[PDB]
Amino acid sequence: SGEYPTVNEIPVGEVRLYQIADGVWSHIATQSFDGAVYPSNGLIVRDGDELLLIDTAWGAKNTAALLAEIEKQIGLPVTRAVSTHFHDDRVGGVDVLRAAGVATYASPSTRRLAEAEGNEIPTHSLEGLSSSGDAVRFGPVELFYPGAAHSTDNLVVYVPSANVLYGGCAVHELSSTSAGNVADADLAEWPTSVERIQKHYPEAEVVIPGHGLPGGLDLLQHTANVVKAHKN
Ligand SMILES: C[C@@H](c1cccc2c(-c3ccc(CS(C)(=O)=O)c(F)c3)c(C(=O)O)[nH]c12)N1C[C@@H](CCCN)OC1=O
Ligand SMILES: [Zn+2]
Numbered sequence: 001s002g003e004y005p006t007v008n009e010i011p012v013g014e015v016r017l018y019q020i021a022d023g024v025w026s027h028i029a030t031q032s033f034d035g036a037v038y039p040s041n042g043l044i045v046r047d048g049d050e051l052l053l054i055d056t057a058w059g060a061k062n063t064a065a066l067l068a069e070i071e072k073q074i075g076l077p078v079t080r081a082v083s084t085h086f087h088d089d090r091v092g093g094v095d096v097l098r099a100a101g102v103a104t105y106a107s108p109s110t111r112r113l114a115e116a117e118g119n120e121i122p123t124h125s126l127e128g129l130s131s132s133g134d135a136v137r138f139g140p141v142e143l144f145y146p147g148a149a150h151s152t153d154n155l156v157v158y159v160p161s162a163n164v165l166y167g168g169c170a171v172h173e174l175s176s177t178s179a180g181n182v183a184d185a186d187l188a189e190w191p192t193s194v195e196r197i198q199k200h201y202p203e204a205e206v207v208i209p210g211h212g213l214p215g216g217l218d219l220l221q222h223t224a225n226v227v228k229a230h231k232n
């Protein structure tokens with residue numbers, strides 16, 4: 001009934017949308033992994049009479065449910081998707097998208113990592129993002145490569161019309177007590193990468209983490225804090 005939906009409020013397989021700003025929504029889904037249930041976020045950005053999707057809903061059936069929820073709540077076609085790193089909460093569902101008319105994109109790094117680790121593989125490579133600090137425009141967003149953080153390939157997304165910063169899994173929610181799943185993380189580089197985000201997007205008004213509740217710019221500093229304390 002209007003608050004941001006949390007992990008215990010979304011059964012695995014169902015998707016909810018949350019209006020962030022005019023023409024900007026997050027999507028929230030839940031998934032089981034190693035015997036625990038986790039929420040995850042993605043983004044939807046209105047692109048004229050089309051929609052740009054950022055990240056899958058963490059699995060094929062969740063991503064089919066995402067498409068159905070978008071048609072119910074928004075009713076515009078998803079034409080393009082970007083995955084912001086290679087893990088299953090970002091690319092799991094790319095095959096569903098690709099069979100539903102969606103052109104799927106990721107950096108070449110993400111594509112190579114997804115292929116090597118047996119995850120689903122976006123079709124199109126996003127050049128111009130291979131050095132930290134790089135930025136490119138993609139429809140109504142800017143894609144930014146901050147450097148290694150949660151993963152070496154992680155991208156963040158800015159919606160300039162709304163000053164919405166979608167951090168993906170390089171950014172954690174304020175309640176987080178650790179740096180999440182650090183399997184592929186670079187804990188030493190992560191604070192430097194967060195500093196790059198902070199410097200590049202100082203006018204962000206909403207910051208959305210890869211998992212959990214959106215907030216303001218404090219999510220970036222909180223992320224740096226928990227990552228440094230995790231590493232130590
Ligand atoms: C599929 C993904 C994965 C699965 C399950 C959980 C997560 C979490 C996670 C965990 C805890 C918290 C709460 S908290 C900040 O308070 O600790 C959280 F917010 C997020 C993250 C993330 O942190 O983004 N991701 C997860 N996987 C799998 C793995 C693949 C490695 C392949 N080489 O790595 C990875 O990320
Ligand atoms: Zn990840």
Ligand SMILES: [Zn+2]
Nearest residue numbers: 089169210211
């Ligand atoms: Zn994640």
